Design an enzyme around this catalytic site. Sequence first.
Site, PDB file in Angstrom:
ATOM      1  N   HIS B  92       0.782  -1.288  -0.092  1.00  0.00           N
ATOM      2  CA  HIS B  92      -0.072  -0.162   0.038  1.00  0.00           C
ATOM      3  C   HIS B  92       0.832   1.304  -0.099  1.00  0.00           C
ATOM      4  CE1 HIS B  92      -3.516  -2.569   0.512  1.00  0.00           C
ATOM      5  NE2 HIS B  92      -3.025  -3.108   1.536  1.00  0.00           N
ATOM      6  N   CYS B 134       7.077   1.209  -1.156  1.00  0.00           N
ATOM      7  CA  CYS B 134       6.350   2.060   0.233  1.00  0.00           C
ATOM      8  C   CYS B 134       6.805   3.317   0.117  1.00  0.00           C
ATOM      9  CB  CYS B 134       6.450   1.494   1.506  1.00  0.00           C
ATOM     10  SG  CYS B 134       6.223  -0.458   1.571  1.00  0.00           S
TER      11      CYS B 134
END
Lengths: 226, 226
Positions: B92, B134
Amino acid sequence: MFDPAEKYKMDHRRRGIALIFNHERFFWHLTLPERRGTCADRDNLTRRFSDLGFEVKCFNDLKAEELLLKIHEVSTVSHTDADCFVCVFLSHGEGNHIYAYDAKIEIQTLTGLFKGDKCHSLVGKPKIFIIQACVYTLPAGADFLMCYSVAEGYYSHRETVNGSWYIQDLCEMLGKYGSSLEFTELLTLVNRKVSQRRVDPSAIGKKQVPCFASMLTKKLHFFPKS
Amino acid sequence: MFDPAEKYKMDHRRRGIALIFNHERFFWHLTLPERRGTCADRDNLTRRFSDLGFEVKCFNDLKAEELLLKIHEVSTVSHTDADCFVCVFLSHGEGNHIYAYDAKIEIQTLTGLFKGDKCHSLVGKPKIFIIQACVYTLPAGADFLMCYSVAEGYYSHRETVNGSWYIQDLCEMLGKYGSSLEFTELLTLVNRKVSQRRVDPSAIGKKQVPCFASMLTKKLHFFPKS
């Protein structure tokens, strides 16, 4: 309208500047195979880049005050008429910890000078850095091509009077295919040649695996200039 | 006898396994665009790899005990009949410091399992790792191809219900040119597409620059299997 074969346009009047930087500052003592191999690398590189059409400048970090002058002038120059920029970092094989730590600072300075924000003249033009490895050695940037003699966690094998395995195998590929193949295709050949060049010392069964990190966006060709 | 166009031979009965790994362990809370975009990435990836001829497996780090089983079984399998191996790491966009630190350990474990010494079945066969970013995120290995969503020192832009810019722009390129172009040539297109995809928030004027590090030695093609 998207073109899968689009190339960086190499039509400009100048090809660009080829910077050959030799790291020799804090190498405490040099054997003659060490003194002779770095010279063969500078000359074999100067030949091959000049044939493709590059203006070659060679610097050494031994002249500390000259260095700041030499690095700054090349950074200020405008490359509007240049197609691309090439920098080569030559370092010796087995050095002390200060020599290797100075190598990291110099590579981070050199690559940082030609970033998109610091060199408008090279925006959209490929920036090619060829590093011979010895608190980071892996930087980035747009339209950058980083080429390392040896990947992380792999050993580089000793310099000889003929030169270095990565350089000589790069120059031979440049002479045969400098104008023929795409640069990433050419470097893929250097990877195989050096890795296949598997070779009396305590380092038996070890292979040197080169590496190249590509942030390029278009194909890179060096068709004969005219 | 040296061949500048030599390719990894993709004649084996199997193409290989395509591993899609989703990092979801310590993401404390998820918005629906975050829940929905990672799903579109898994599905768009599963489609495109299956079309090229890959066996697809999807794992999540939410099942801690299942994970050790799932990672170990795929490592023990023999890829003698496989052409290549593909691993994808999905993470994410904006996570805490533990989520990002766990991402580094997982990538270093996954890439380490398929090194030349740990996977004789894949020696001389390309190992392709596609990482969505990330105490290091940059490993190495022989015949490895590392693909990162964003280079070092560059920002990655938020996940949407349609998916991620790097993934969707990779899948679209795979569908159009999966069998047409060489993989490094295909990824160079992803670099341009994502970088040109320059896009209400406080991040104005920022571009996401992807990157791929190549330790491959031969050209990589995915011609239609049969």
